[PDB]
């Protein structure tokens, strides 16, 4: 498969700089080109830009001029963006693609996008706790996690490595006084808890954060 | 330099349905040698990235039902979905790659289908919080429809207000449901001097309140 | 490499 590797979650102050990667494997990285996507929270997409890496040649959205510059290593099948003098309103979901320059033109194939967020705010690792439930007769039971006092987003959360995918809500963070709060559900049977183990999974990239909340009752 | 519209901005139908949605164009995008129209259109659900659906105009990308078909020429562009799903969930995006790039701003299609009323859950704060200092009073409404919920504390029987935070999921891909998260955080101390905890949701199933409390005992 | 496809 055709596969475009970002790298993860990064805070960077204002009026600096951010350089972030594209890795490309499963195909001839010199026959296509690659056009960065940027995406604000809860806005559309607005294109950067593109870089041909077989050549170097750039082209640009005329507002990311001098903003944002897209270089190519050949050696390493790895485009990268930089963003300079950067400010609050370039904090942002950042996409790289392949785009099939010279029949379709379409970008065909999409990384999982890097988070960017702009702030002076420190890094803060979560604070994690667990709610456990009486009963209104379910032959379910409901879970969940407090994710609290965390920056910058994101948090991932899972539950059981992974394992328990259905029955989970994760809801999305709220910001409060430079601090960020989430929680998670996971519904599942009656029969596997408490019986079972159930453990969430917090990880925060930013602080290289990893917590493991096992819920247990009363 | 080249300006894309989509329209409707927002639109709901039910599974199996039909869906148009149309995209326009400030100049052509018909490109005389060639003969095509340089129009894609891309699909992004929630959380995830953005996938192609279709290109020049009216060709299906690999991996894409056939369902989702493109059409239109020059400056005027639909999309047409035949038979929703609950998994076509997404914003719709039309694009422009004639001369540069440019994004339409995008069409947001929810889905449609019969009430459903939340599952209730109260959780108390957990020792570790209490620990701490603070206390933490939690109420997952889960799985219902339609979007508009409204929710109560009450605390021995009076309403409050403050230390409330309140959080809401995207539609679910699967059963085109809703969820939300309403915490009420308040010092343990606080906590501590009163014993009633209460969570009403309110959702236009009914009037009366889904109510779920519990004791600090 | 060109802008694109109408180039």
């Known amino acids: 498969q055709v596969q475009l590797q970002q790298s993860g979650p990064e805070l960077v102050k204002p009026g600096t700089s951010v350089k972030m990667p594209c890795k490309a494997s499963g195909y001839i990285f010199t026959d296509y080109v690659i056009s960065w996507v940027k995406q604000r929270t809860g806005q559309g997409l607005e294109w950067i830009g593109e870089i041909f890496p077989r050549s170097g040649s750039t082209y640009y959205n005329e507002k990311f001029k001098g903003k944002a510059t897209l270089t190519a290593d050949k050696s390493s099948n790895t485009a990268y963006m930089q963003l300079s003098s950067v400010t609050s309103e370039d904090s942002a979901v950042y996409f790289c693609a392949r785009d099939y320059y010279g029949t379709s033109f379409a970008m065909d194939y999409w990384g999982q996008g890097t988070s960017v967020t702009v702030s002076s705010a420190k890094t803060t690792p979560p604070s994690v706790y667990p709610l456990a439930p009486a009963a209104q007769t379910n032959s379910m039971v409901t879970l969940g996690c407090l994710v609290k006092g965390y920056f910058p987003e994101p948090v991932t959360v899972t539950w059981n490595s992974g394992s328990l995918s259905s029955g989970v809500h994760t809801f999305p963070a709220v910001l409060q006084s430079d601090l960020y709060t989430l929680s998670s559900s996971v519904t599942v049977p009656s029969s596997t808890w408490p019986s079972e183990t159930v453990t969430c999974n917090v990880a925060h990239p930013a602080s290289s954060t990893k917590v493991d909340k096992k819920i247990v009752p009363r | 330099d080249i300006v894309m519209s989509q329209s409707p901005s927002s639109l709901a139908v039910s599974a199996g349905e039909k869906v148009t949605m149309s995209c326009?164009?400030?100049?052509?995008?018909?490109?005389?040698?060639?003969?095509?129209?340089?129009?894609?259109?891309?699909?992004?659900?929630?959380?995830?990235?953005?996938?192609?659906?279709?290109?020049?105009?009216?060709?299906?990308?690999?991996?894409?039902?056939?369902?989702?078909?493109?059409?239109?020429?020059?400056?005027?562009?639909?999309?047409?979905?035949?038979?929703?799903?609950?998994?076509?969930?997404?914003?719709?995006?039309?694009?422009?790659?004639?001369?540069?790039?440019?994004?339409?701003?995008?069409?947001?299609?929810?889905?449609?289908?019969?009430?459903?009323?939340?599952?209730?859950?109260?959780?108390?704060?957990?020792?570790?919080?209490?620990?701490?200092?603070?206390?933490?009073?939690?109420?997952?409404?889960?799985?219902?429809?339609?979007?508009?919920?409204?929710?109560?504390?009450?605390?021995?029987?009076?309403?409050?207000?403050?230390?409330?935070?309140?959080?809401?999921?995207?539609?679910?891909?699967?059963?085109?449901?809703?969820?939300?998260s309403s915490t009420l955080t308040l010092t343990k101390d606080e906590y501590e001097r009163h014993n009633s905890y209460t969570c009403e949701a309110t959702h236009k199933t009914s009037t009366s309140p889904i109510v779920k409390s519990f004791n600090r005992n | 490499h060109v802008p694109g496809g109408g180039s």
Do not use: H
Request: charged share 20%; glycine share 8%; net charge positive.
């Open chain 2, 24 to 180: 326009k164009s400030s100049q052509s995008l018909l490109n005389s040698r060639t003969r095509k129209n340089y129009l894609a259109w891309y699909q992004q659900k929630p959380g995830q990235s953005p996938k192609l659906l279709i290109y020049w105009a009216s060709t299906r990308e690999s991996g894409v039902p056939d369902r989702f078909t493109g059409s239109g020429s020059g400056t005027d562009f639909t999309l047409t979905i035949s038979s929703v799903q609950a998994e076509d969930l997404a914003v719709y995006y039309c694009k422009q790659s004639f001369y540069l790039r440019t994004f339409g701003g995008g069409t947001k299609l929810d889905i449609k289908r019969a009430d459903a009323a939340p599952t209730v859950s109260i959780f108390p704060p957990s020792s570790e919080q209490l620990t701490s200092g603070g206390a933490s009073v939690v109420c997952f409404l889960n799985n219902f429809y339609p979007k508009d919920i409204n929710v109560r504390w009450k605390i021995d029987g009076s309403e409050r207000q403050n230390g409330v935070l309140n959080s809401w999921t995207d539609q679910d891909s699967k059963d085109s449901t809703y969820s939300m």
